[PDB]
Symmetry: C6
Subunit: 112 residues, 6 copies
């Protein structure tokens, strides 16, 4: 019944920052990832273009590679040593949140 | 008509977690699923990237396979023994809900 | 002027459940439907993945076939005898609404 | 900044129902329309699947053809005699509005 | 925390109506525009199908051509003499706003 | 659960205006950018078509090139001398904000 006009603009938020230490080979391949299976870091970012910035921060933080960047949805999958990927995820959230005023989530993990 | 700016960000929610014990061959095929027809588990997840995590929790929970993952829509279809898929769905919802503050739905079933 | 953050999640709703007893051949073909022209049942479902469940309920209800399933938008077109398609549409809304707490619309028809 | 979860579902609305008596050949061609240029009727419909119903009501109302149907966006372009397309647009809006509780717009025209 | 269902329908609005007298050749080509570089008129229109109407009004207003029409997003790029394109943009906003009750923006320009 | 109809229209906003002085070669390549790696400027703009205007303001402001434009998402990536890209980003935000009533973000930078 009640009616309203909504002007949409993207928010600034890292919704997910999640570590999987030992993902399955099938999951890894279904994501289109190449190289030996490794730990992955998974980011959900709005606006979608901030994925570019998260990639730069992450790869500059240590020996982490971009598994994939999706500038259309904001998704980023990072690869590398599990502790390095964790450090990257932390740097991404630290930088976006503290220096660019994004809402950020805590780093979450799947280690088993 | 009232007017408001709405900054969009994805929520954190498992909206569907549904078991179909005996899906028809046509459906199973229209979904692009391969192998013999089996029970399927159907998940709807926001943000879409959390489908990756749900897949990991599911395949680690027992003898359940990824039928498909859609990181763009957040859909996951799981395959395996009906009881194993059921356990996987419960583990996805238990884990995302209790450990990651997602809103979760109850597990629903089509057994006939 | 006024500003708000909106966390989006899909609702649970069957918005359309509509019967067309005698659709035109041009409409039928433009929808990419095969076989002899027949009555059609048209569903609009959120979240999109619940289209899979609606298909299963519908095809289990009687001699109704999936014309198409669209798991990306939630659209389902059913085909068969007009009264069978009507029964299917009713079973879909009955099951989603009563057992899965979806908001459901009434079955609507175009018989002429 | 205030924050809210918004569960999305499509509304039921015909937002545009517009007659162009004499569209230019370039436009008619940029729309992918075939046959000789004719008057066109333009519909915007939510939910998108209701475009199927609008098409049926239109073609059954008289000598009007589907130029195209888009079940993804809900767009319908109708073709035929300008007066017949006009009658079709009025029948789409009368039927969806009175019989199916859609919000409907007034019919608008470009006659020059 | 707080939760609401939002039934979405498109608004009726021309958000952008902007003139660029001398766009760069690289910008012109990246937009996929053909012919000699010329001034461009840029429209943002909701619902997306109203782009069709804006095109018709614009091309009927004088010697303005459709650079492109995007019925999926509502974008229209017009080409021609800078003053003619300006006149077109004004006719589009005049007609949609005054005769079809769209919210319209003012015409904005980049002349240098 | 409360319910409301929301008519959607795009807002007018520059959400991101970000300088990366030294992006890695892999990122630069994953973005589909050609030529030698250079500093990049990253814009997020609503409505998406305003990316066209931002491009024009940027290339006219000095020796800055369009790496890419995305009129569907509103993304712009600029390339050139780090100081020139910075000036371009400031001119995009100054111009859209002061002359066209867009909400604008502050310019942000990754210099390390």
């Amino acid at each position: 019944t009640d009616r309203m006009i909504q002007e949409y603009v993207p928010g600034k938020q890292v919704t997910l920052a999640h570590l999987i230490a030992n993902p399955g080979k099938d999951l890894f391949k279904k994501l289109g990832l190449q190289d030996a299976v490794s730990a992955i870091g998974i980011l959900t970012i709005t606006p979608s273009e901030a994925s570019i910035i998260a990639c730069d921060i992450a790869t500059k933080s240590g020996a982490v590679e971009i598994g994939f960047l999706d500038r259309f949805t904001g998704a980023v999958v990072l690869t590398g040593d599990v502790s390095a990927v964790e450090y990257a995820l932390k740097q991404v959230t630290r930088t976006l949140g503290e220096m660019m005023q994004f809402t950020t989530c805590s780093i979450t993990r799947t280690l088993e």
